[PDB]
Write an enzyme that holds these catalytic residues in place. Structure first.
Site, PDB file in Angstrom:
ATOM      1  N   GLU A 172       0.872  -1.124  -0.078  1.00  0.00           N
ATOM      2  CA  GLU A 172      -0.146  -0.005  -0.065  1.00  0.00           C
ATOM      3  C   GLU A 172       0.852   1.256  -0.069  1.00  0.00           C
ATOM      4  O   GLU A 172       2.032   1.159   0.430  1.00  0.00           O
ATOM      5  CB  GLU A 172      -0.989  -0.066   1.309  1.00  0.00           C
ATOM      6  CG  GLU A 172      -1.770   1.401   1.454  1.00  0.00           C
ATOM      7  CD  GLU A 172      -2.614   1.653   0.333  1.00  0.00           C
ATOM      8  OE1 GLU A 172      -2.828   0.801  -0.540  1.00  0.00           O
ATOM      9  OE2 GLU A 172      -3.043   2.570   0.225  1.00  0.00           O
TER      10      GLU A 172
ATOM     11  N   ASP B  44      -2.328  -5.102   1.170  1.00  0.00           N
ATOM     12  CA  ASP B  44      -1.491  -3.879   1.666  1.00  0.00           C
ATOM     13  C   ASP B  44      -0.032  -4.154   2.125  1.00  0.00           C
ATOM     14  O   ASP B  44       0.751  -3.402   1.990  1.00  0.00           O
ATOM     15  CB  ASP B  44      -2.314  -3.305   2.934  1.00  0.00           C
ATOM     16  CG  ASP B  44      -3.773  -3.033   2.423  1.00  0.00           C
ATOM     17  OD1 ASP B  44      -3.691  -2.001   1.405  1.00  0.00           O
ATOM     18  OD2 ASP B  44      -4.579  -3.378   3.212  1.00  0.00           O
TER      19      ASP B  44
HETATM   20  O1  DBH Z   1      -6.350  -0.621  -1.944  1.00  0.00           O
HETATM   21  C1  DBH Z   1      -7.250   0.008  -1.955  1.00  0.00           C
HETATM   22  O2  DBH Z   1      -7.466   0.849  -2.888  1.00  0.00           O
HETATM   23  C2  DBH Z   1      -8.384   0.172  -0.902  1.00  0.00           C
HETATM   24  C3  DBH Z   1      -9.531   0.757  -1.124  1.00  0.00           C
HETATM   25  C4  DBH Z   1     -10.631   0.785  -0.017  1.00  0.00           C
HETATM   26  C5  DBH Z   1     -10.144   0.235   1.213  1.00  0.00           C
HETATM   27  C6  DBH Z   1      -9.134  -0.418   1.345  1.00  0.00           C
HETATM   28  O3  DBH Z   1      -8.778  -1.235   2.623  1.00  0.00           O
HETATM   29  C7  DBH Z   1      -8.131  -0.539   0.376  1.00  0.00           C
HETATM   30  O4  DBH Z   1      -6.947  -1.039   0.849  1.00  0.00           O
HETATM   31 MN    MN Z   2      -6.827  -2.136   2.848  1.00  0.00          MN
HETATM   32 MN    MN Z   3      -4.745  -1.494  -0.191  1.00  0.00          MN
END
Ligand code: DBH
Ligand code: MN
Ligand code: MN
Length: 179
Positions: A61, A89
């Site tokens: 992430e 993530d």
């Molecule tokens: O990776 C993402 O975009 C994401 C979007 C909404 C909620 C999350 O937890 C995310 O990791």
């Molecule tokens: Mn997430």
């Molecule tokens: Mn994410």
């Protein structure tokens, strides 16, 4: 709410949240709840990556999407682990699984289930946090020690209080419902 986000999270987190929103066509100045939420999710991901032994986690992430995928592919090709359909993530080198981290203003189990059926993976570990101190993880395997999770829970609760004390909390709590 906009100014609150900018003084509540560190510049680096704020900058990564702005990018992430611009990529999707959202405006931080208008959709200020999603701004806050994205900053929160990022903060939790970093705290979490910090929570273990100093090189336990690949951080996925926060990266640019294409580089995130490249890193994901390197892990799969080198570990054997199955390839996720959505960007996770983190990857945990100790446990050999990707981790999806969630932060919800709603019930842990609700979010957990929405997130689980979206990814369709008997491999990717899921770990949800709430602004009320609750956490839920796949097979109640919380990955981290108690102390690291507790620190996160406290931080989340502080953000909720900080919002509440400015009257921004209701709007923020409801907004995840409106989505
Ligand atoms: O990776 C993402 O975009 C994401 C979007 C909404 C909620 C999350 O937890 C995310 O990791
Ligand atoms: Mn997430
Ligand atoms: Mn994410």
């Amino acid at each position: 709410m906009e100014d609150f986000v900018r003084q509540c999270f560190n510049p680096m987190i704020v900058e990564l949240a702005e990018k992430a929103m611009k990529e999707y066509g959202e405006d931080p100045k208008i959709e200020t709840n999603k701004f806050a939420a994205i900053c929160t999710h990022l903060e939790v991901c970093f705290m979490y990556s910090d929570g273990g032994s100093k090189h336990r986690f690949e951080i996925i992430e926060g990266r640019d999407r294409t580089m995130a995928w490249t890193v994901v592919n390197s892990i799969c090709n080198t570990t054997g682990v199955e390839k996720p359909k959505f960007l996770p993530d983190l990857y945990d080198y100790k446990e050999n699984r990707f981790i999806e981290i969630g932060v919800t203003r709603r019930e842990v189990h609700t979010y957990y289930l929405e997130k689980a059926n979206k990814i369709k993976s008997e491999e990717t570990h899921i770990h949800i946090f709430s602004f009320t101190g609750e956490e839920m993880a796949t097979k109640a395997d919380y990955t981290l020690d108690e102390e690291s999770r507790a620190r996160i829970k406290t931080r989340l609760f502080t953000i909720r209080q900080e919002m509440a004390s400015r009257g921004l909390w209701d709007s923020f709590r409801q907004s995840e419902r409106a989505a």
